[PDB]
Write a protein that binds this ligand. Sequence first.
Ligand SMILES: [Cl-]
Lengths: 201, 242
Amino acid sequence: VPTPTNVTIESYNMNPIVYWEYQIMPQVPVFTVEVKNYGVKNSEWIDACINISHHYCNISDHVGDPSNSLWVRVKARVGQKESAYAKSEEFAVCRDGKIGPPKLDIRKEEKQIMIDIFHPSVFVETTCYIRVYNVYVRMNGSEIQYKILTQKEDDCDEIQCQLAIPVSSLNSQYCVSAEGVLHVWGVTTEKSKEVCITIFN
Amino acid sequence: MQDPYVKEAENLKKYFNAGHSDVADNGTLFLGILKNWKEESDRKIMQSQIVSFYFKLFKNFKDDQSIQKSVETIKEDMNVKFFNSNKKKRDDFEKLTNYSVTDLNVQRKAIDELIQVMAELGANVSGEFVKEAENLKKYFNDNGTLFLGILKNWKEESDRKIMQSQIVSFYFKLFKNFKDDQSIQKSVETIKEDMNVKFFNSNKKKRDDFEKLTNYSVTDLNVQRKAIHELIQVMAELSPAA
Ligand SMILES: [Cl-]
């Protein structure tokens, strides 16, 4: 049989799925998907899905540490005739996938606004964690950006990070959004929709 | 926002074909071992062997055409992360990694300083230990030391562990090469075990991780490919813990 083509791996919120395409044949082909993780005991590929006729396979159950690389291969079959394997490029969930946004809450005090940044739900001992949050603030018609370092700071824990912003210049509306930056490859999470608060002068 | 050394390590991966699935075969060289150790002094003795292994590997390829810039960039980032850009710390470490355990004068100096070295490791040696060491000083028979002057240069504990890791591994190699030598075979065995007891603080797991690290040949192509595949993750954990 011909070889599967365009083998691709996509991940949103650490849920990797493998996809491929196949040409029309005079009969209905079936496929088998195999996964190999970096740090394997010997030199073995593990079966993810066996003999399916659709063109995708969720491999979430075969991810070790999100920072570690993995490879996938797919072959087609016709009764007794199997094709050659089509192979994926090296994939690491932390480097190649995308993570959803953090959730933000704002409240006001006398001369400052307090912002609570809750880590994206997927994160609540791997090197795949958020190292810094880039916080974008708009106050009336001005804009400023702040950075929170999650490790060198008492401000952050396993559930959230906190930030205090000073109120000034007769500004009455403060709008805030944030995105996280992952350790190791510096990949960014999605940016949160902006939340606003009104200060009465 | 990505650290500049990352793109250069991805260039080395391409050069060595370390993005191929064959590289996965047979466990890990460095990553799993580093996972096991969380206190900073234990991390520094393991990291010290990992860094010298990468430095020996890069010396074999420093000039290769399309990767000369990449290697230069990565060595300089290791300098910043592991040596805190301290040129004297980096120089003392290189001196220690380059001593030949087969040069008879080097072996003499090393056997001469042994008692003082254990002192520097924080050990209170037994009367027994002292006699076995005089056997060796006899067998093997300058205004420069091998190890004592370097050890006097560093007082912070993490800097000390970086250097002590390279001294303990030199001795363990010297002992291996004389393990079954008639005259001094019982001396060698006696010293060898009190050094292990003290440095590894009676932790067999720590001892074993250390011998694993110490017995990889950076010469085999497959080991070299795995080392290059693990580089980016190893660099991400080289800085001081918190
Ligand atoms: Cl320093």
